[PDB]
Amino acid sequence: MELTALDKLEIMELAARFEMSLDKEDVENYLATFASDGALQGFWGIAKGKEELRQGFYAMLDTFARGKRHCSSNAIIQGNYDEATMESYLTVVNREDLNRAGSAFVKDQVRKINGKWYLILRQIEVDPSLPLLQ
Template identity: 30%
Template sequence: MLERLLTALILATVTCACGSGAAQSGAAQSGAAQSGAAQSGAAQSGAAQSGSENADTAGGGPAPAGLSADDHVAIRNLAGRYSQALDLGDPAAWAEVFTDDGVMEMVAQGYEIKGEALRSLPRDGEPSRSRHIPTTFVIDGAGDEATMRSYVTVVSTDDPARIVFQGRYEDRLRRVDGRWRIERRRILTDWIDSAVAEGVADAP
């Protein structure tokens, strides 16, 4: 994050008891100092404005606006829609989560699924026996592009219920036709239950 250096101009009034001439001289020097400070401030202000204009025009125009509060809410809802579509076996809702060229990568397992193959999951429409719980969102971006980092815990709903996966999502997002979608999701494994390691592809 860029930090702005704040500067303060401190004007000291020197009091002299050596006669009126010395006092007047001190006052004149103080006035000159104030005048110089004012001119310096004006020059700095002009330079700042010029720099801002140059920054806007250097790339052909102003930079895209940052994400709004509504964007943050929509992106968090996207994370929830991903989990519910997967857990409840809703193919139509799942297809709406990703862009047409979306990619999902399982980093530790060394594979990825993309495009239509990704958007066609889940195939059978049957609810899964797991619940994906995303938390701790960090969202950044501007315009129609964003990134999101989050933690995820997967809980098996079998009896007895237990945690079967803990990891992280690293997402690249894009706004398409007014809706945020996942362009690429990287899934990083922190821990996985050995009994379900072979079937992790069924619970991304």
């Protein structure tokens, strides 16, 4: 069967949940967005499974992700009722001052497992502006 409007909204909420949880430093709600064997990849490496995702969460906060607002935009989703791909943008701004922090193109593979959508693979392609890359 086809992807429903409710499915699309739920998949978009995975991005919103990931980003908000990261900003709040809420590791449990962050981890909930991933499948048990889900993965996060960026220039920094790959974190896969819950233990590595948990460590990765703190590592990202420590290196570049703390004290920001990470915002998702331009979601495009394609797939069916249990497997889909999302492409979107990530823009990052500082909470403590009026500067920007970076941006990225994001590609997500998502899956419906036991009736709920989860991130299988999130790939973040960071734009060259990121201070950690300069």
